[PDB]
Amino acid sequence: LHHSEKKYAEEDQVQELLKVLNEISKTTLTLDPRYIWRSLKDLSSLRNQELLNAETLCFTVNVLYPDSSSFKKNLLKFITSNHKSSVPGSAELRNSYPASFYSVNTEKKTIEVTAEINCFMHLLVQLFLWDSKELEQLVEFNRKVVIPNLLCYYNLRSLNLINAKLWFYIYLSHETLARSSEEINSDNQNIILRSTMMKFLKIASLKHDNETKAMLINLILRDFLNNGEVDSASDFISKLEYPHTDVSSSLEARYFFYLSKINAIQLDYSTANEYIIAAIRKAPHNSKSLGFLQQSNKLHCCIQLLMGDIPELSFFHQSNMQKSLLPYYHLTKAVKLGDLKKFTSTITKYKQLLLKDDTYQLCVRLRSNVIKTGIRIISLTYKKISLRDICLKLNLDSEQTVEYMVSRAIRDGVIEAKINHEDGFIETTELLNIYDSEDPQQVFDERIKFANQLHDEYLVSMRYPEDKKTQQNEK
Amino acid sequence: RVPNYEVSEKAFLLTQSKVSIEQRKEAAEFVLAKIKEEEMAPYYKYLCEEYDQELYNELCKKNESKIKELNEKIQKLEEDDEGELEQAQAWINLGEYYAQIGDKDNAEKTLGKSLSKAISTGAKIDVMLTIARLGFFYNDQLYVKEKLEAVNSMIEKGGDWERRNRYKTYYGIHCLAVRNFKEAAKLLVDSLATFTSIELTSYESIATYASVTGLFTLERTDLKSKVIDSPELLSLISTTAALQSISSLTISLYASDYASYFPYLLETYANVLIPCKYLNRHADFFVREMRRKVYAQLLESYKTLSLKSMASAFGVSVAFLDNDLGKFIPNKQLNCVIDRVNGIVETNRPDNKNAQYHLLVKQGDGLLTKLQKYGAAVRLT
Amino acid sequence: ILDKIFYGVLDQGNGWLYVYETPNQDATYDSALELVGQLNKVVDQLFEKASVLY
């Protein structure tokens, strides 16, 4: 019953492991092994569900075990020791073959294979922990093991591609346990989590390994948002060591999401609007990106309202993301009219929902924007309008108070008008036809460069498959 | 079939509490007469919410009667030897019984049997449409959408010119009922000529609706040719009140007497838009558009006007004008700004080189988006 | 004015009629709008050809 299932399950894994193993040890084609390693994990995660998941335990018994046996034991001990065939050497299905691990010769140190098997074994272990939620003890111990094991080795480029997945897991398990409920011991370890991924940024930069660099940068920036030091992020982000050379389009989308948040609060929407839209396109569009898709829509609503733009009514209506975008919808209307009263009621009533995603922080600041946006629209409609008429409409106290919020606004050229107080109206500053003006030359200049960039891109890339095909044997 | 559109529109006046109390109860007497006549017991339960068990006994009875009638018939017919032809004609009579009682679901089932045994392609199209009609009866437009799709698959498979005329009108009603009034304007003006009376909302109704879709969509120029000088509309004259109200409105627009336009607008809102079910939901869309389109035409003919002068002509106050116009400016058809102090409404419209610059720069930006998306994709793959 | 038989504008504030005839509009750009229009169909077709890569 139980043994047969685990064995078959183990066998399935053994097949996959062997493919990727051969692949790394036969010439250099790094990119292909890496893609294989990504699929292997998912296949194994879907697998576990069925044919039992103590197939890992089986493989541990039947490999060369330096400290993986004791780690595995540690794992069962957390979830109460269940032994049933868990003693090393009680399976030998290698059988000392030169086709599937030579048991004697590795021990002797004429051939070495514990390298890669170790790196893979920790990866399997982490996958199992997160799926189950075997957190607590195992997390600290894991972090402890992997760091001297991976630094024991003279780091390749190959090896670096595997460990950039391990680094993510260390970070995740520590965080998740933390938000469940605070502990003192959890903050002691926080200091240590920051210091290790940060030191490693330099190591990864010498090796110029693209996967590792990308990963570390995302984690460090997340860390800064958690603790609220915007300042630290500024120094870090001036230098851009973020590769965009070969990394997963998914990492690119994650990077841009950080940038948006930070810039927005530093009062820039020029960059923010570009990066959250850019991220949507970069991000896949599967049923595994529902999280990501939803939250991008949420941050972008805020960015536009902050600048003074009114987002499409159509954007929230025709979405299937309307259910969630219920607070955002209400904001949009309040702002539009310049009605102050509605805005107070909206922001108080939806405090909790906005506070989850920390968009609440942005919403206090939309108090300025309620009054200002109603006046953008009123100047548009009425060209010359007495301060008296403005005051009555939007409830604003007196002609002197309205003049002050407007005077500031036009410096920044939001409203684009000029005040005449010695007559008593405010007169919109027209630009009318801009073709007549010299505006189009600047528009063109940029676009030409974008076209030019795609041509060069086409050309380098086109050659890439061709070089491969020629060299291979053909009939 | 035929009674269903009549029943539903009367039911809809009763639902509304907007219309005059007189009309609401005048409609009560009339819907009641047809409720009894057709035995609407399953369907009465839908209608009684939205504004005798005998109707039900009468029902159930009508059930075993009309229900049994067709049953044993259907069986003698399945026993008798011609399978293709005889069974299917009988299943058409089966679908008629459910269609009398206003149950759209069981009507679909038996009419499906009718199709199943092979019948004339043309005949299949008649049958699909019958089901489609019952979708208007409930006011389930989603139901109509899918039914009408299956007809257009078979319309050119058959070559039927005969069923193409019906489809035009039903599809007119579909487009009319939905928010897109563009397709409606086209489909329905050509359904005037090719009107087929058979199971459809009267000829008088169609003519009114064509005018409505005409006004929303079509340019001043394009109204003149296609609606005003439209030979049919002139053949049909103005007899029904609704036709008169909408027609008169059209005329004073072209002739640009704006003393008589705004009184007609009030009339069309009361008597045409609100009582028609389709145009109850679109009342808002249509009246906002009409206000913007008339005001746009008058601004085009004036570099400058007074607020008092524009208002006085309409027969609305200076205060009233000032609010109603400031709704319409940011949606941008009016293309004007108002100097409050001088009271002038100056009009600024581009017609120069700027027109040809905007169109170019926007279209060419839409093209670049596509090049990037597609290029970058193919490199990866 | 609306018929476009002499298309002008009437300023009431001065009680004057200015009449305008043949307003200038870029002809170069008129030819370019049809050219961009073709390019847009073409990129949809090309991708469809390139659906074989997937």
């Binding site: 498959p465 044997n473 053909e474 | 290029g375 193919v378 | 890569l53």
Partner: peptide, 27 residues
């Protein structure tokens, strides 16, 4: 031109695999 040369490559993969396949059949 990207597409056209690219389509050729995809086919080139197939002709290459065949070479190996055809060698097996004579052996």
């Amino acid at each position: 031109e990207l597409m056209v040369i690219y389509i050729s490559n995809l086919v080139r993969s197939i002709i290459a695999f065949d070479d190996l396949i055809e060698n097996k059949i004579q052996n």
